Every structure is written in C-alpha cells, then in structure tokens.
C-alpha cells in the first residue's frame, strides 16, 4: 500500500505523466533487465537501454536465443530497434519492428565512464540497502 | 350478481409484529404455540399485546404497579406487563414484588432487587405458569402521550378544551381574537 500523501494512485494522472514524460524521463522508463551473468557480476538488476547494446528478445513473434545489437532507441514511440529483428514490406523493403525494452534482456553493455559511474552507484545503493536490511 | 358491499370485508388487525427483533420473534413463536394449544385466554391477550406497536404498549411505572398489586385480594401474585417497567422517583417504600416484563429500566431493576423481589422474562414466565394461572395483567396509561391533548373537538369551537398547534407559548401568540370577549367574540 502507498502511504505518501504526495503521489497519486490516479490512473488518469499516471497515464498522462507516462505519455507526456520528457526525453530524459523516457530514458529512465526505457529500462531493460541485465542477463543473469551480468546481473551476478555487477549486482545491478536493470539499466536504461542504449543505442549499441547486444540484447535478446524474450516475448512475442520474434522471441528466440539470438544476440542482436540495438540500432536506434526511438524514444517518441517507446520502442527500440535491433539489427536483425525486421519484417518484409510489400514492395521488398525491410523495415524494423519496434519492441518494448521491458521485453528485452541486455547481454553486453556499452561501457564508458558515465555508464560505469551509474553501475557503481547502483551497486553501492544495493550494498547499503542489504547492510541495513540484515 | 350478489348484492353485497366489500368495504369492510378485510380486517385491519396485526397478524405479526412489525419489528424484526429476533428475540421478540422467538417469544412470538413460543406464545403462538401456547395460545393455540391451550384454552387459556391469557396467552391470547399476551401475544395480542406482543404484536402491538410501542405507542400501544406504553411504559408502566412502579407507582401504578405497587398500587395495583397492593389492591386487596391479589396478594403475592405475579404482575405481567407486555411493556416497560420504569423507575418512579417520588416513591419511598417498595414491597416485595414479582415482576415479568419485556424490559425493566436499570434503576427500577435495582430497586426491585434490593427490596427483595424477583424479575422474570417471558420464557421463564411460560415455564413457571404456562396457563398464566396466578397472574395480574397490567398495562401503562395508553393516553399518556402528549398527542392526545391535540385530538378531539377542534379548538375555536364552544366547549372544546383542545390544545392548539402553536410554535411558542406567550402573550403575542394566538390569544386575542377568538379568545377574548373584548376582541370580537369568545367561542
């Protein structure tokens, strides 16, 4: 149950906020879970998706075990494009099929200084939380 | 082709209590059986009164109860009220009484018990005397309610001592024209 008297349970308000969130909030919404091995080796459960990460598709018509590289993150439509998840149009052109990041599992992150800083921050937060809990 | 009138064919009496009190309904079941299976009219009167509305079973006071039980001849009998027995404050001596009633107020119960009597419920009464033998059946003043001072011959009519409906009692409220001989007429 929610006890904070300054956040809503209003369905309409939550939908409006989600569909009108600015880009830097779209980034936070567009988060995907790391694989089992990455999760074990980083102590971090999820990471906002980036443009050049290897991922897998877990649900839908394109689910499988193949490793695909993200092509572009289309924040306006809340979908991401992978390098070989695509269908065939009528004329013969191949266009990409959008997939929600919540149905995708990250396989190998694109590391830079800021990404590493995010990972270490999340790891430290989970460590302090576990110390408090136990 | 029958020459009859159907105005008064349907009687209006109460066939069952209007209340939904489960305890009262259990009492009604018991006394229905008693009055059907015995030839004593005490049970018939008792369930007739159990059916009635609160206004038709007014409370009975200790003063009336003591007077009617101290009437000569009816010594150490059981007084039966299908209403409420209520404490009376301007009485000093309470005799050893034997009471059966639907409910007794707390202070009246204390007075009766401290005097040294006994208070019963109607199921205990049915077990003690199924036919109501050795009982005194009483009831409170049915016309004690204040609404009865407004009924009858209308006011403003000769020889009618009927209370009028006035928002307040005072000098300026309904005392001049029909009530004075100086202000026109007096009925």
């Amino acid at each position: 149950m929610k006890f904070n008297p300054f956040v809503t349970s209003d369905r309409s308000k939550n939908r409006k906020r989600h569909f009108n969130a600015p880009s830097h909030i779209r980034r936070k919404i567009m988060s995907s879970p790391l694989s089992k091995e990455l999760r074990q080796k980083y102590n971090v459960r999820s990471m906002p998706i980036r443009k050049d990460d290897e991922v897998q598709v877990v649900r839908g018509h394109y689910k499988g075990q193949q490793i695909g590289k993200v092509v572009q993150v289309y924040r306006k439509k809340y979908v991401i494009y992978i390098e070989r998840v695509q269908r065939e149009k009528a004329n013969g052109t191949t266009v990409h099929v959008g997939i929600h990041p919540s149905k995708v599992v990250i396989t190998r992150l694109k590391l830079d200084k800021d990404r590493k800083k995010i990972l270490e921050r999340k790891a430290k937060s989970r460590q302090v939380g576990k110390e408090k809990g136990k | 082709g029958v020459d009859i009138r159907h105005n008064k064919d349907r009687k209006v009496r109460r066939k069952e209590p209007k209340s939904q009190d489960i305890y009262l309904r259990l009492l009604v079941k018991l006394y229905r059986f008693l009055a059907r299976r015995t030839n004593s009219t005490f049970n018939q009167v008792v369930l007739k009164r159990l059916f009635m509305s609160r206004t038709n079973r007014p409370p009975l006071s200790l003063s009336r109860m003591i007077r009617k039980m101290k009437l000569p001849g009816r010594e150490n009998k059981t007084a039966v009220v299908v209403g409420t027995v209520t404490d009376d404050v301007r009485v000093q001596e309470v005799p050893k009484l034997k009471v059966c009633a639907l409910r007794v107020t707390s202070r009246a119960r204390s007075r009766i018990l401290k005097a040294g009597g006994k208070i019963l419920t109607f199921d205990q009464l049915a077990l003690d005397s199924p036919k109501g033998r050795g009982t005194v059946l009483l009831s409170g003043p049915r016309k004690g309610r204040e609404v009865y001072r407004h009924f009858g011959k209308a006011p403003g009519t000769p020889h009618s001592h009927t209370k009028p409906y006035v928002r307040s009692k005072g000098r300026k409220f309904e005392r001049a024209r029909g009530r004075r001989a100086s202000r026109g007429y007096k009925n």
Partner: protein, 51 residues
Amino acid sequence: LDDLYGTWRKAASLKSNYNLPMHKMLNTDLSRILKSPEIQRALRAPRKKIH
C-alpha cells in the same frame, strides 16, 4: 476487553457510564422449552385429522 465493555455486575471502567445491554428472553432454546414437562402437562390433545 472485559474492562472495556463491563460485565453484568461490574460496569465498564473505561466508559464514563456504561453497562451491558440486557436480554428480553434468557432461555433461547425454544425446542427445549417446548418439550419440557411443566409445559407439556398443560396442553390439549393435538388435532391432526385432516377433514
């Protein structure tokens, strides 16, 4: 809870003036009341002959 709502003899102590409500009929075992000797003695014989 007993102190809160009082007993039949002892009134509630955490209420300024409260005591438990009373029972209009004590023995609610109607069948036991009906098939008791004192009552069963004072009845007329049943008529269960359908005419």
